[PDB]
Amino acid sequence: AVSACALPKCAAAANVAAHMTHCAK
Ligand SMILES: [Zn+2]
């Protein structure tokens, strides 16, 4: 999830989808 994102910040508007799209793997 964005809250536990590993990448250098992804959610630029509180959007897990935009984040998990690459993260969580
Ligand atoms: Zn991320």
Task: Write the secondary structure of 4-24 as one string of H (helix), E (strand) and C (coil).
Answer: HCCCCCCCCCCCHHHHHCCCC
Query: CA 7, 23, 18 angle in degrees (round to 5)?
Result: 95
CA of 4 to the centre of ligand 1 (A): 8
Binding-site residue numbers for Zn(2+) are: 5, 19, 23
Q: Are 10 and 2 in contact (CB under 8 A)?
A: yes
CA of 14 to the centre of ligand 1 (A): 11
Count of the separate structural domains present in the chain: 1
**Parent domain of 25:** 1-25
CA–CA separation, 13 and 15 (whole Å): 6
